[PDB]
Write a protein that binds this DNA or RNA. Structure first.
Ligand SMILES: [Mg+2]
Ligand SMILES: [Zn+2]
Lengths: 119, 302, 447, 99, 497, 489
RNA sequence: GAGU
DNA sequence: ACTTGACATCCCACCTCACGTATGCTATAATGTGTGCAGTCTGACGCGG
């Protein structure tokens, strides 16, 4: 399932898509919710397979990916992308010395998530 | 890392059909073993002891399994981690039992790293162990004879054989299995027979206990002709595609057809064959089909 | 001198001798590494050179090598084996002339070895004639099998030429698997000499040789009669036989007792023979640490019982008797070294004195006026050995501190606690002390 | 060998290595993985902060332990600051965004 | 053809980053004519310098800043260094006697006055005046000014031309960008008249609706021209002769600079070779080479063809010297003044000899003997002699540790002691509470206890209410009663520390 | 500063000005005798902060009374030493230099933005050939290589309109002038009429780069570095070994060379040095800069005085011995002990033998708290003195703390989660840890001198998680298969 | 040089 | 309880001194060179060409 993390877009939403873009399966379903309910033009998708290393490097957690391999490369790509890491995953919090969003740390982490909605 | 139980049930109907693995020689891992503690998606029907039906969305506990064992259902759609609807993570239901605890997994537990540790662990162990305890090297490669254990009918699925002079039922198909039917018609035992294997009893006839029904020499896969006549040589020249090994005495030899490595630069595309011609000369055709029998001997075919 | 001392000190091949026991030293000296300049590293070494070659026969022990990433790279020289003229490996072999086994030995290199047909030592030999069997057991051109007597050119000197020095000491290697064989040779290298040396019950004949060559034992170089015996001096009167008409015939061997090995282990010599004993050239006068009268005394031998106990012997764990401590067997002497350094900072030159601010006079009591521990005093971890004072510099009186300094006084003398502490949880006796004063400053009382 | 408190590392401000320095054991990524398998977040956080590079945090938690509190109250591990500054040395801007 | 060979070798350059190769290639094309070729360009140096000096004699402001800057330092009683040492240092075709200065400046003023009288009569330079102006310029050629002073005089003219061109640029910026006027017509009218206003309204006389639009901001346009005209007035140079001087001077300067370019690039090989001798593992090859080039710069500029001797010989020392001084100062992390460096050098040369005489080593005493320096000083130098060893140094022979994995921060007061200091402050306030309100505040303030600041006796007295000496007695009373074990039960333990 | 997210982008040169507090003009670190920081040097107090807490350079001003005090004579601010981990400095680079990372690392964003191969850029940068920025003349437009005398054959005939230059500064210029907005639209229009397959694939890639670039708001001119940020001194500290000797970071040696060469460039500029040597210096500048960021990426690297390659910023982050894996995702930890395992047949499933001296040390602070609360010791100082002597009383207090405390046992390698388990520790004489036989299978431990680590979860929460979730008795079944791990052997 |  | 004045000890700041430091100048002629080790593995995804 982790290896199925990414898909390929045919057809524009309201967002930063277009032909052949390799975007996360999660961002596709988020677009689904918001666009189907409101309307706008639809986007056709197809699922893609990435093995291990590539899949890891593709995930939207660049400190995760930077901790894995190809530190140099991943940093540059994210730097050019102006990428913003929202810090939902594990090792992110690990490194920051925070509460892991798993298990015992579930409570605190969901509290911050609701605090995002409240301004 | 990111895979965690966020939801109890997103409400997916999708799922993967798990079988009892009858890979060749036996049923190495059964359905019970593969499915225990999993949530099911959908109900499976089979003509059985009384027309089996089994309610869905249900986690199959040990005892559920026992009941379904008596019914003998073969294929089960089970709700999978993959077929999960949940974003960034999975459902309690789609995962199932947390094996270490015995119960349903706890929402929030990091199942991802769970899986990883379990799967990395043994690899790391199964290297170290037979490397510092097994001070030598060997493998069970006496894949000599098949032997039917209990008295039942012989029934074959997927092959097309051609009867010879000595009288063996020689198999020329890559898709061959040799199964065992019991009293009232089921697939009990299963064997895997490769290309070129001599058979004894074909289709329909009963085998008594522990009788030799199949046979083949291990270290040598023969290619066996379906039709008769004189061997005609095509593109097997010496040095380009074959190597002369000849002695004195009455002047006997054994040709070795070498693969890509030993071939000179000119004999790259030359596909060596043995063409089936008759007493008259002309391509005798395999019975009922159009092929002029040209058996492509592979790399290093002695 | 730079490039030389580069080689000697910094190079890979120059290492601290392992002196755990004489075996360790001897084995180390003859071990052979595939690394170094013009040679391989850990990644650079594949299966190629690590794996076990038929050529290693009688030249390197196939069975002596460090486990782990070093494996395959470093290997001990086999017993009888030496380097030829060109630094190639060679093994001595017996000639066999027309069926009969001659007495001549020739050293052959690997290249030379490939050529000829060699019988094993194990092959059965008719008393000063030929071979006992008509179809005999030998190897030619690197390959083993059956040959007849007339075809056989040469033969192994003894079985032990196959194996290194370490491996040769193991008694019933014949019945032991190679994995554990390997571990066996390795462990022998780490054995420590106890207080009381015991000769091994089960040896191989090699245990005399090993000790002999280790050279840490003292050996009689003339022979004659022992004139004076001391636990420090062994003096022998030579026979007029070996006596030089030039000099005098008295040979003096000063022994060394309890010196420190690189491993912190014991290096002590005991005199073997008695005053007025007549002894021969090459007799063992004084034994090194793990050595009995001529023999390697690696460890000690106990009555073992093979049985499962109430899980005290669980998984290779060992159950043992208080009687072992009662007899003081397996008690190690460790001579540990510590250094006290009096440096000069620009904060002021540090000094060694008995002068130690806010210490218990328990710690002061054992020190001389120089600040040096007394000879022979027994102390414990944390206890002060050598006194030292260092330049301080305070004046950071945060408010509260000033208050109390005023009230009670206790006027602060600037000095850190540089004084020489003993290591954690460690307790033994001071066996000796050394003092090196630099030329500039004047002599210390104790010095 | 064992260590509660002793000399720390110069750059990272982590405990040193070896009996020679009174050093602490490295609790490695392996060990991390173990904690992660359990849901044990606070133990992990201990290892990451109060036990290592968080100065204010370790000192505060020490005092809390004596006082019989056992509250954690974490700080920022020095290693992470090491990280930030080295990235900015490479001319790469990394800012930690406020909510 | 030389450039063609460069480019064929450049087509093969297989990404060889080694700058050694690159430099070697370029220099490899440039040949070196010797003997007289060198002196050729040296002559160009001399004539460039004299060019600008001719201008100084001829130009009004130039002589002004001379006498004007003589008075600044000389008038104030009797001065001989600073500004005077920067100037003068003259060669008549060194300790400067007052007698000669009085004399050499005397003939200048008379010349000045006579050279002025003719200017006025009839024309600017009517025939005779042109001949006497030329003779005036030939008088000034005789002097050479020291480089430092020469710069600032050259600078006044350089930036003046900037002002000219920049003022026109700013004027034409607003004029051409906001208004609009063809620059070809500009040529004739501006070169002819300049000073008078005829060209202003004559330009508008060509008619065409745009010329008439101009009155709404008429005041601004021509008044801005006044700034430019005022530059004319204050400069006091007529545009017929103004151009002549400025551009001709520009020419002299360019000649000299480009000439040196040729010279320096011709001598590359020399620098490099001499550098590679001291390349001997001190810094890097290239760094050295750069330093050597700096030495050649120096050689070029102080080189005199008059010496009659080979260039290589002279330049060699300047380049050699640059390299030596640079290693001494750069090189090590611990920067060292050269006095110390030279002493180190002595040390090691002697070390060799002494090891060979003794058969062993040199003890500080024996060493100190042969140098006739104080042993303490020797030992100091020996210690200071240690070079930076790397913090990143793999201490682990097995790549275990980067030295850093040892280093502990003794600055850090241990959490043990930090707990101690906390308990202490808390304890202090609680015993403070035992004291009488104002007595408590007395000691609280006196030592800054629980306040960001410490007040000493007098300042406490001020804040209290007069009483200074009574505070001594209060201090003593606190002392006395706090010596009592009652209040001091808590404080008692700390006496051990 | 309680945060939501982390964003990464190109550092602007003026943003680098912002973080940097002062310019490091001198390569010097400190004075050789008085090891105080030098003026505008690498360890400068005026820039990076004071050496010692709340005390300025010249030493007139000390104490907390002065905070934010700015010493008039020396220009030293009075504050915490800690600042030397966080103030950045900077260098003014005379020649705008390209960032190595965006060149030599694949794909190389510069190369892909300009659709220009590596070699071209190299020859340009290394001053081997000139290149055309802006061609009024139709003959040549963007990105044309000109040699030495091709540039002359070009200049002589044309010029005026014809714009070309050499090096990283030229590339910087071509970066500013290329049209961000227009080209994106151009490409999609190109797509609208005709799309042969592979051409459309590369054109697609490029479109992605460009759009992502202008959405993020990163400016291409930032590829060229004008300002070079300089790492805080504590991160590249300079320390004496006790023998008088020194250790310095490799960063310091690379940085020093950077400054040396940059200052020489200032001299060469003021002297109006000939083109050849100016070019050579720009090569050298580029080298030093790129060596500092990532050494050896560029080919033959700068070595140690030893032989060993100098360790660059990149190595510091990236390497397995880099900051990530060695110091961030894992570290050394306190309140842990390690020693040999010995059999404990008598121990219960949830128990373990804990050696006297080990536990004494471990549980130090717990000891002190109870010592003071029970009043057995007057204060914490006396409690320490009382621990270091070691009377009967000490052991009893240890007993009470260890009572109902769970402690963690760890064996490397952490094969699975049960490589660490929680136990109730029971004190024993000796230095050996006792392990329960049953759990040997999970640790894959055997008694032939294996060692284990013993960590202490300190908080109530840690204790809870250890006893509840990690306890031996709680975890018998393998998470791997459903079956037992803790079993007969 | 330990063990997995 | 507090002040005053006398007499006696301690703390802060500015001046002459002496060593330490920064930079210049040298003239037979000297002018295209340094330099090493890296490697061997090994399947790998990737672009370039
Ligand atoms: Mg073990
Ligand atoms: Zn100051």
């Amino acid at each position: 399932r982790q290896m199925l993390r990414k898909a390929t877009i045919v057809n524009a939403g309201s967002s930063d898509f277009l032909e052949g873009e390799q975007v996360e399966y999660s961002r596709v379903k988020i677009a689904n919710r918001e666009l189907e309910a409101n309307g706008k033009v639809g986007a056709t998708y197809s699922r893609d397979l990435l093995g291990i290393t590539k899949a890891s490097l593709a995930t939207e957690s660049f400190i995760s990916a930077a901790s894995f391999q190809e530190t140099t490369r991943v940093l540059t790509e994210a730097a050019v992308a102006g990428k913003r890491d929202e810090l939902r995953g594990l090792k992110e919090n690990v490194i920051v010395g925070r509460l892991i969003p798993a298990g015992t740390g579930y409570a605190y982490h969901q509290d911050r998530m609701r605090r995002r909605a409240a301004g | 890392q990111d895979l965690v139980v966020t939801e109890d049930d997103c409400g997916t109907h999708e799922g993967i059909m798990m079988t009892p693995v009858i890979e060749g020689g036996d049923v190495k891992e059964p359905l019970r073993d593969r499915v225990l503690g999993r949530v099911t998606a959908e109900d499976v029907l089979k003509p059985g002891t009384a027309d089996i039906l089994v309610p869905r969305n249900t986690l199959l506990h040990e005892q559920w399994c026992d009941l379904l064992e008596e019914n003998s259902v073969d294929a089960v759609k089970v709700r999978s981690v993959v077929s999960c609807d949940t974003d960034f993570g999975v459902c309690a239901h789609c995962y199932g039992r947390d094996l270490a605890r015995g119960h349903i997994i706890n929402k929030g537990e990091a199942i991802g790293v769970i899986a990883a540790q379990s799967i990395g662990e043994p690899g790391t162990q199964l290297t170290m162990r037979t490397f510092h305890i097994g001070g030598a090297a060997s493998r069970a490669a006496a894949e000599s004879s098949i032997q039917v254990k209990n008295k039942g009918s012989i029934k074959l699925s997927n092959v097309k054989s051609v009867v010879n002079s000595s009288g063996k039922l020689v198999i020329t198909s890559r898709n061959t299995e040799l199964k065992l039917i019991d009293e009232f018609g089921r697939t009990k035992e299963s064997y895997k027979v490769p290309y070129g294997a001599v058979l004894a009893k074909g289709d329909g006839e009963q085998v008594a206990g522990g009788e030799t029904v199949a046979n083949w020499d291990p270290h040598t896969m023969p290619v066996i002709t379906e039709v008769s006549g004189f061997v005609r040589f095509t593109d097997m020249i010496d040095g380009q595609t074959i190597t002369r090994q000849t002695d004195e005495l009455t002047g006997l030899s054994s040709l070795v057809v070498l693969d890509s490595a030993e071939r000179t630069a000119g004999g790259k595309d030359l596909r060596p064959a043995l063409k089936i011609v008759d007493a008259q000369g002309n391509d005798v055709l395999i019975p009922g089909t159009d092929m002029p029998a040209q058996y492509f001997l592979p790399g290093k075919a002695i | 001198s730079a490039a030389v001392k580069e080689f000697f000190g910094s190079s890979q091949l120059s290492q601290f001798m392992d002196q755990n026991n004489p075996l360790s030293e001897i084995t180390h000296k003859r071990r052979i590494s595939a690394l170094g300049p013009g040679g391989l590293t850990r990644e650079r070494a594949g299966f190629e050179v690590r794996d076990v070659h038929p050529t290693h026969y009688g030249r390197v022990c196939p069975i002596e090598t460090p486990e782990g990433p070093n494996i395959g790279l470093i290997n001990s020289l086999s017993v009888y084996a030496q380097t030829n003229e060109y630094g190639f490996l060679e093994t001595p072999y017996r000639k066999v002339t027309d069926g009969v086994v001659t007495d001549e030995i020739h050293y052959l290199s690997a290249i030379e070895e490939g050529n000829y047909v060699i019988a094993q030592a194990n092959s059965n030999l008719d008393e000063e004639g030929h071979f006992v069997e008509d179809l005999v057991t030998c190897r030619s051109k690197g390959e083993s099998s059956l040959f007849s007597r007339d075809q056989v050119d040469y033969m192994d000197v003894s079985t032990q030429q196959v194996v290194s020095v370490g491996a040769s000491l193991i008694p019933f290697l014949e019945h032991d698997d190679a994995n554990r064989a390997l571990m066996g040779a390795n462990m022998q290298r780490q054995a420590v000499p106890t207080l009381r040396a015991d000769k091994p019950l089960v040896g191989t004949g090699m245990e005399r040789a090993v000790a002999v060559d280790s050279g840490v034992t003292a050996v009689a170089k003339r022979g004659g009669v022992v004139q004076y015996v001391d636990a420090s001096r062994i003096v022998i009167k030579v026979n007029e036989d070996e006596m030089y008409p030039g000099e005098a015939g008295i040979d003096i061997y000063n022994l060394t007792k309890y010196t420190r090995s690189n491993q912190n282990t014991c290096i002590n010599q005991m005199p073997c023979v008695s005053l007025g004993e007549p002894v021969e050239r090459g007799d063992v006068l004084a034994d090194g640490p793990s050595t009995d009268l001529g023999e390697l005394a690696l460890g000690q031998n106990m009555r073992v019982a093979f049985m499962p106990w109430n899980g005290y012997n669980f998984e290779d764990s060992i159950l043992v008797s208080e009687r072992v401590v009662q007899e003081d067997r397996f008690t190690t002497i460790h001579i540990q070294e510590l250094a006290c350094v009096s440096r000069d900072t620009k904060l002021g030159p540090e000094e060694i004195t008995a002068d130690i601010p806010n210490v218990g006079e328990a710690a002061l009591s054992k020190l001389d006026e120089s600040g040096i521990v007394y000879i022979g005093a027994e102390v414990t971890g944390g206890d002060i050995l050598v006194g030292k004072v260092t330049p301080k510099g305070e004046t950071q009186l945060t408010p509260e501190e000033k208050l109390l300094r005023a009230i009670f006084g206790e006027k602060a003398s600037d000095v850190k606690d540089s004084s020489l502490r003993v290591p954690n949880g460690v307790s033994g006796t001071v066996i000796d002390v050394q003092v090196f004063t630099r030329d500039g400053v004047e002599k210390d009382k104790r010095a | 060998h064992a260590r509660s408190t002793g000399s720390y590392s110069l750059v990272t401000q982590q405990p040193l290595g070896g009996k020679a320095q009174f050093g602490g054991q490295r609790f490695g990524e392996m060990e991390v993985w173990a904690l992660e398998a359990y849901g044990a977040a606070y133990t992990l956080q201990e290892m990451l902060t109060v036990k290592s590079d968080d100065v204010n945090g370790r000192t505060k938690m020490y005092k809390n332990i004596v006082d019989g509190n056992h509250q954690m109250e974490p700080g920022m591990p020095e290693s992470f600051n090491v990280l930030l500054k080295e990235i900015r040395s490479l001319g790469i801007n990394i800012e930690l965004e406020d909510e | 053809a030389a450039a063609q060979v460069l480019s064929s070798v450049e087509s093969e350059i297989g990404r060889t980053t080694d700058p050694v190769r690159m430099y070697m290639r370029e220099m490899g094309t440039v040949e070196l004519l010797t003997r007289e070729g060198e002196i050729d360009i040296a002559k160009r140096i001399e004539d460039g310098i004299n060019q600008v000096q001719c201008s100084v004699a001829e130009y009004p402001e130039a002589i002004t800043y001379l006498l004007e800057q003589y008075d600044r330092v000389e008038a104030e009683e009797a001065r001989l260094s600073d500004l005077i040492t920067g100037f003068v240092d003259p060669n008549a075709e060194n300790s400067i006697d007052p007698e000669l200065a009085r004399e050499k400046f005397a003939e200048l003023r008379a010349q000045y006055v006579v050279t002025r009288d003719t200017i006025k009569a009839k024309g600017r330079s009517h025939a005779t005046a042109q001949e006497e102006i030329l003779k005036l310029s030939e008088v000034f050629k005789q002097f050479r000014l020291v480089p430092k002073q020469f710069d600032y005089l050259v600078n006044s003219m350089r930036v003046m031309m900037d002002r000219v061109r920049t003022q026109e640029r700013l004027i034409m910026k607003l004029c051409v960008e906001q208004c609009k006027m063809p620059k070809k017509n500009f040529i004739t009218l501006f070169t002819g008249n300049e000073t008078s206003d005829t060209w202003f309204n004559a330009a508008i006389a060509m008619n065409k609706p745009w010329s008439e639009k101009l009155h709404d901001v008429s005041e601004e346009v021509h008044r801005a021209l006044q700034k430019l005209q005022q530059i004319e007035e204050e400069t006091g140079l007529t545009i017929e002769q103004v151009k002549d001087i400025n551009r001709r001077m520009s020419i002299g300067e360019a000649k000299a600079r480009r000439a040196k370019k040729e010279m320096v690039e011709a001598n590359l090989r020399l620098v490099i070779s001499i550098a590679k001798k001291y390349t001997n593992r001190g810094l890097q090859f290239l760094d050295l080479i750069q330093e050597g080039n700096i030495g050649l710069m120096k050689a070029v500029d102080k080189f005199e063809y008059r010496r009659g001797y080979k260039f290589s010989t002279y330049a060699t020392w300047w380049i050699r010297q640059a390299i030596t001084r640079s290693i001494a100062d750069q090189a090590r992390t611990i920067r060292i003044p050269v006095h110390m460096i030279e002493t180190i050098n002595k040390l090691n040369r002697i070390s060799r000899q002494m090891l060979q005489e003794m058969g062993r080593e040199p003890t500080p005493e024996e060493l100190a003997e042969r140098m006739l320096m104080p042993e303490d000083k020797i030992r100091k130098v020996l210690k200071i002699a240690k070079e930076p060893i790397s913090m990143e140094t793999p201490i682990g022979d097995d790549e275990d540790s980067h030295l850093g994995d040892f280093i502990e921060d003794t600055t850090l007061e241990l959490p043990l002691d930090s707990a101690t200091t906390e308990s202490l402050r808390a304890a202090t306030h609680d015993v403070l509470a035992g004291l009488t309100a104002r007595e408590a505040k007395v000691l609280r303030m006196r030592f800054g206890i629980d306040m960001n600041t410490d007040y000493t006796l007098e300042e406490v007295g001020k804040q209290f209410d007069v009483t200074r000496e009574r505070i001594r007695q209060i201090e003593a009373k606190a002392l006395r009663k706090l010596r009592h074990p009652s209040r001091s039960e808590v404080l008692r333990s700390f006496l051990d520390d | 500063e309680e945060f939501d997210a982390i964003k990464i982008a190109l550092a602007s040169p003026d943003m680098i000005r912002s973080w940097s507090f002062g310019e490091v003009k001198k390569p010097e670190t400190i004075n050789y005798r008085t090891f105080k920081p030098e003026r505008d040097g690498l360890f400068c107090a005026r820039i990076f902060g004071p050496v010692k807490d709340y005390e300025c350079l010249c030493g007139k001003y000390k104490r907390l009374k002065h905070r934010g005090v700015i010493c008039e004579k020396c220009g030293v601010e009075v504050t915490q030493t800690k600042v030397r981990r966080e103030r950045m400095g900077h260098i003014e680079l005379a020649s705008p230099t390209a960032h190595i990372w965006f060149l030599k690392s694949l794909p190389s964003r510069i190369g892909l933005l300009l659709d220009m191969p590596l070699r071209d850029i190299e020859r340009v940068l290394y001053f081997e050939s000139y290149v055309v920025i802006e061609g009024g003349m139709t003959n040549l437009e963007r990105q044309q290589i000109l040699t030495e005398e091709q540039y002359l054959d070009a200049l002589e005939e044309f010029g005026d309109e014809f714009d070309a230059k050499m090096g990283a500064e030229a590339i910087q210029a071509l970066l500013k002038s290329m049209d961000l907005e227009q080209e994106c639209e151009q490409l999609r229009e190109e797509l609208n009429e005709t799309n042969s397959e592979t051409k459309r694939k590369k054109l697609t890639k490029r479109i992605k780069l460009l759009e992502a670039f202008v959405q993020s708001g990163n400016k291409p001119e930032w590829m060229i570095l004008t300002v070079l940020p300089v790492l805080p001194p504590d991160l590249r500290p300079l320390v004496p070994l006790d023998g008088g000797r020194f250790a310095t970071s490799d960063l310091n040696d690379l940085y020093r060379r950077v400054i040396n060469r940059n200052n020489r460039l200032k001299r060469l500029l003021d002297l109006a040095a000939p083109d050849i040597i100016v070019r050579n210096e720009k090569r050298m500048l580029q080298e030093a800069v790129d060596a500092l960021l990532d050494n050896g990426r560029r080919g033959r690297a700068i070595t140690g005085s030893n032989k060993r390659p100098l360790k660059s910023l990149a190595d510091m982050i990236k390497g397995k011995q880099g900051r990530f894996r060695q110091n961030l995702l894992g570290k050394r930890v306190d309140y842990s002990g390690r020693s040999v395992i010995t059999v404990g047949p008598y121990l219960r499933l949830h128990q373990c033998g804990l050696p006297k001296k080990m536990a004494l040390e471990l549980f130090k602070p717990f000891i002190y708290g109870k010592l003071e609360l029970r009043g057995l010791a007057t204060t914490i100082k006396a409690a320490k003195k009382m621990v270091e002597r070691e009377e009967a009383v000490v052991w009893d207090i240890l007993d009470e703390v260890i009572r109902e405390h769970p402690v963690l046992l760890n064996r490397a390698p952490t094969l699975h989660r049960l490589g660490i388990q929680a136990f109730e520790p029971v004190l024993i004489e000796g230095k050996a840890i006792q392990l329960h036989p049953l759990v040997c299978a999970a640790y894959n431990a055997d008694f032939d001198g294996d060692q284990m680590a013993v960590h202490v979860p300190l908080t109530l929460e840690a204790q809870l998680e250890a006893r509840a979730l990690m306890m031996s008795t709680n975890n018998i079944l393998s998470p791997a298969n459903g079956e037992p791990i803790i079993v007969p052997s």
